[PDB]
Design a protein around this ligand. Sequence first.
Ligand code: CL
Length: 479
Amino acid sequence: GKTLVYGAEFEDEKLNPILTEDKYTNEEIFTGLMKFDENNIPKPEIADSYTISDDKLTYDFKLKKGIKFHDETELKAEDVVFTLKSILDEKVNSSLKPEYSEIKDVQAVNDYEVKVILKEAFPPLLDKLTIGIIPKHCFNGKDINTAEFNQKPIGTGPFKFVKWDKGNNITLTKFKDYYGKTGNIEKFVVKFIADYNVRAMQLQTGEIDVAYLEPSQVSKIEKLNNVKVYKVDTADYRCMMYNMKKDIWKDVNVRKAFNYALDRKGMVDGILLGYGSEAYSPLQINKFNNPDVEKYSYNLDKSNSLLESAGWKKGRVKDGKKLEFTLTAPKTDEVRVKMAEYFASQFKKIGAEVKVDALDWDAIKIDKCDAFLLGWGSPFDADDHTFRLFHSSGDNNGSYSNPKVDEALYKARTTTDENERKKYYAEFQKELAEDPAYDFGVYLKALFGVNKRVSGVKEKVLGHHGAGFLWNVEQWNVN
Ligand SMILES: [Cl-]
């Protein structure tokens, strides 16, 4: 069934499941021991069975025999051991290493049976082991960081790599020997189009099939007779990072005040135009969300009635230091700078002078900024975007440190009983409400314009910028 074209707004860096955390073309070329299903639950993929011991420290996998890479080489436990051990390799220096560092060792006791040993109990291990397995033989004479594999990948996904034109497109075609049952499309081309206006016209002409839409352009793509617009809930949220290195935020009442000075629903209508929801929780869409924590209910008078007791007064000053900072917000996510523009201008009504800076990611250092507009949230396990974000620390960049939040996130990370994992995640959220690390804003809605000739799309809670909207493209149908 011919070709399906995707107009991606970001271009891949390396086509290796390790070294990269982005859910770009890697999601169509590689698969792992597990794979998230329709309900964002990791189900066996490359492995056919697994069982855990009574301490929960040993994950006894058993692999499907005959799994072939793109080069028609059989996948064995060597490659699974190679992929997971190369993450923890100190010299490879992967970005995902702190996310797998609770693994003691990954053992191969059989060509088709892998054993994963942890340091301590880690229930969300199967969530992380959905990482793609790479062939070990393609790396012997190379060093894995600068290997040619990152230019021509070989994996076990339903679409093998074909061609990559830098700055233009990545070419894949249907892998006939793929183990999963598949739809009818035979070619998948990912066009890198950063300007959302070109994506709209390429959807209008039909030059592309799918495109992540900004909220402002949905009203026109709606009128298109050849495009359907998908509006689906995500776990992606934006916020403001309270850099704890700044004494302006060491008083918690100042942060609670700044949280009180935001019209988040007015932000849902101003910037999102209703395609979103006010943010108050680090795990709002997660099943372990605490519905009754202290949300900061747009209390303009409480913000102005917290700074003066905290010491800040004019009409802006405490001890002569004048209450002003700089809010950093990167470009190519123009919702964020519009949020920052709205953030600073709405903090003017409480006597704060903020300088908003729209900069490029290659010039921003988050841990050096007074306040940064972050973009986090994940629809998988509650440990994904919480431990590495609200701990002494992963890459917690706001220097946040709460002793009860540290323990609450560690118990839920280490305890098996999910009903009590709810308990610890509920106490962490409650403590995060009174001791805020972030100034939460809005939760986002993924907007995709899909051509009317495409079938098979199944919605679910998505990740960053719609990461995982095309999770089942190998079952989508042309005509
Ligand atoms: Cl970010």
